[PDB]
């Protein structure tokens, strides 16, 4: 009784506005008030799944340092405003929105071409100001989902992303929580005293729902705590590995090599679906195919062999797993 | 006059507000001084040196 | 196994290069140097560690040694490469071997500021503060009490 | 991806068999401090244990005296008992007696035992003694509570004492850098704890982890 105390629960999701929200957890025995409050504040501020804009491309732009006859703000200000946009997506983990406007007016959020799953949170968010009469802005916006925050240059993966000069890279700053205050107070509970009703107030982007964010943060915290809820000598290092030598290409099919679909159906019609079983396909066992000229054979030799392998090798590792 | 102005706002005259470390979660004693100071950035940024 | 491929790899920064570097400098001392090296301490040695950004972190006490303020004062670095030199730098000019200034045998590593304030505030005595008059079963006990 | 990085610890160092130093690596960019802080605040205050809280020496009914029979002023004996850890199973409260005659120093091994309770370090030197003819008679009421309960607020004759219900003598934690293969930096946690010898440190850590999981239970959904 005096030990093995009770446990809290979420009793209210009172939202004083569309953004400012308040939740009340109760009860907390003692000290758990400040403890849980600070811990949840840290978790919330740190990592909540956001969905801010990450990529844009406009027609007339060649670099974010340009201008565009007709729009009041410069391109860079449009980038900053876009970054300021707040949106939620539900099903997918990324989406490509489109915004087309023409004529004088303040181009705002709601004037984009929303899909069925994407949902703007506040319409009057000003994106730009079309001030010339027959000015036209048509832009595409890749909006993705992630965790935490990431700058622009740190997103570099290859050179094809920057290949289209129209690519503009806004630094994604998605974290639906903007400020998180909390405080405890004496809860006039059923029969006890000094049980602490904790109140958490959150100013957020209207992207995340209060109870949603609370339960997501609680799951994160409970899982990360579970890592040493039964801590031990789990220490990782090991040695003397025996690895399946075959390259993962062999598991993959032909279409995992960027080949012409004609040669794909050709090796279909010549008993080739895997890649570990087309290396078990002699060189005479390829050109017999219905209607191989050189082009389909070009793709074959290119994405099968010329990438490092042969057009059929007498190998004896496959199958080690199939 | 600065005291009068702070008094116009709902902020304490002493220009000192208690805080709470985000690490510990507890408070500091000795109410710290917090305001809005102007801050520049000089063209001595590290990229030109390292 | 070829220097050309080595340059390629160090140009591609595959994490293998990262932990290889981490291992290769595990004990490899290096030399931090103020711009005007007034006296013998102007150049000293340290075992480096890897951080981010482009700045050179260093212990505070030794920055007070160099007369090194943090007003943007630039410091140079110098890796000693031959084995004799590395062992030398570990033996002589590593900071942990220069605490008495060769000018005067007074300790050159003195906590200057922002740490002396801390202790002085800690080792003070408010007359009637919360908890006065108790009895504590050891320093760890009082520490638990305060935390 | 919203799927975090759970640590893969490397060491559980157990110097002195009661003073452990666990390390964890890696954590998120800020999780180090949050987990350390939550665990410390729990272990210090909210950690059910057992300690002595009431004392009565049938001669000295006073908060002060100089009781002949030992070379220890009463306050010293009380401070020495305040650390006398003792583990009690399903019983919730019990008084103990310490009738030990003779010459030498009073140790806990002389404590008149019970059926359920257990003394952790009977070699605990309670108090020394006059070189002749002293059987210090005292009853000590122990309890099972939450954590620190100072004797000041205990006032609500007798002789109280600042109880220390929690089984941790001290706890600290430091968060250092921890590199992942290319990732810039992460939090490597180092928790150093010295316990009251009634339970191993790792036991206390897992106990606090369990207590916080039970706190959270009504929120997670997996
Ligand atoms: Mg300077």
UniProtKB/Swiss-Prot annotation, chain A:
<dbReference type="GO" id="GO:0032784">
    <property type="term" value="P:regulation of DNA-templated transcription elongation"/>
</dbReference>
<dbReference type="GO" id="GO:0071973">
    <property type="term" value="P:bacterial-type flagellum-dependent cell motility"/>
</dbReference>
<keyword id="KW-0240">DNA-directed RNA polymerase</keyword>
<dbReference type="InterPro" id="IPR011260">
    <property type="entry name" value="RNAP_asu_C"/>
</dbReference>
<comment type="similarity">
    <text>Belongs to the RNA polymerase alpha chain family.</text>
</comment>
<feature type="modified residue" description="N6-acetyllysine; by PatZ">
    <location>
        <position position="295"/>
    </location>
</feature>
<dbReference type="Pfam" id="PF03118">
    <property type="entry name" value="RNA_pol_A_CTD"/>
</dbReference>
<dbReference type="GO" id="GO:0042128">
    <property type="term" value="P:nitrate assimilation"/>
</dbReference>
<feature type="modified residue" description="N6-acetyllysine">
    <location>
        <position position="294"/>
    </location>
</feature>
<keyword id="KW-0013">ADP-ribosylation</keyword>
<protein>
    <recommendedName>
        <fullName>DNA-directed RNA polymerase subunit alpha</fullName>
        <ecNumber>2.7.7.6</ecNumber>
    </recommendedName>
</protein>
<feature type="modified residue" description="ADP-ribosylarginine">
    <location>
        <position position="262"/>
    </location>
</feature>
<dbReference type="GO" id="GO:0036460">
    <property type="term" value="P:cellular response to cell envelope stress"/>
</dbReference>
<dbReference type="GO" id="GO:0000345">
    <property type="term" value="C:cytosolic DNA-directed RNA polymerase complex"/>
</dbReference>
<dbReference type="InterPro" id="IPR011262">
    <property type="entry name" value="DNA-dir_RNA_pol_insert"/>
</dbReference>
From Swiss-Prot, chain B:
<comment type="subunit">
    <text>The RNAP catalytic core consists of 2 alpha, 1 beta, 1 beta' and 1 omega subunit. When a sigma factor is associated with the core the holoenzyme is formed, which can initiate transcription.</text>
</comment>
<comment type="similarity">
    <text>Belongs to the RNA polymerase beta chain family.</text>
</comment>
<protein>
    <recommendedName>
        <fullName>DNA-directed RNA polymerase subunit beta</fullName>
    </recommendedName>
</protein>
<comment type="function">
    <text>DNA-dependent RNA polymerase catalyzes the transcription of DNA into RNA using the four ribonucleoside triphosphates as substrates.</text>
</comment>
<feature type="modified residue" description="N6-acetyllysine">
    <location>
        <position position="7"/>
    </location>
</feature>
Swiss-Prot record, chain D:
<protein>
    <recommendedName>
        <fullName>DNA-directed RNA polymerase subunit alpha</fullName>
        <ecNumber>2.7.7.6</ecNumber>
    </recommendedName>
</protein>
<keyword id="KW-0808">Transferase</keyword>
<comment type="similarity">
    <text>Belongs to the RNA polymerase alpha chain family.</text>
</comment>
<dbReference type="GO" id="GO:0009408">
    <property type="term" value="P:response to heat"/>
</dbReference>
<dbReference type="GO" id="GO:0016020">
    <property type="term" value="C:membrane"/>
</dbReference>
<keyword id="KW-0548">Nucleotidyltransferase</keyword>
<dbReference type="GO" id="GO:0005737">
    <property type="term" value="C:cytoplasm"/>
</dbReference>
<dbReference type="GO" id="GO:0006352">
    <property type="term" value="P:DNA-templated transcription initiation"/>
</dbReference>
<dbReference type="GO" id="GO:2000142">
    <property type="term" value="P:regulation of DNA-templated transcription initiation"/>
</dbReference>
<dbReference type="GO" id="GO:0000345">
    <property type="term" value="C:cytosolic DNA-directed RNA polymerase complex"/>
</dbReference>
<dbReference type="GO" id="GO:0036460">
    <property type="term" value="P:cellular response to cell envelope stress"/>
</dbReference>
<dbReference type="GO" id="GO:0003899">
    <property type="term" value="F:DNA-directed RNA polymerase activity"/>
</dbReference>
<dbReference type="GO" id="GO:0008023">
    <property type="term" value="C:transcription elongation factor complex"/>
</dbReference>
<dbReference type="GO" id="GO:0071973">
    <property type="term" value="P:bacterial-type flagellum-dependent cell motility"/>
</dbReference>
<dbReference type="GO" id="GO:0046983">
    <property type="term" value="F:protein dimerization activity"/>
</dbReference>
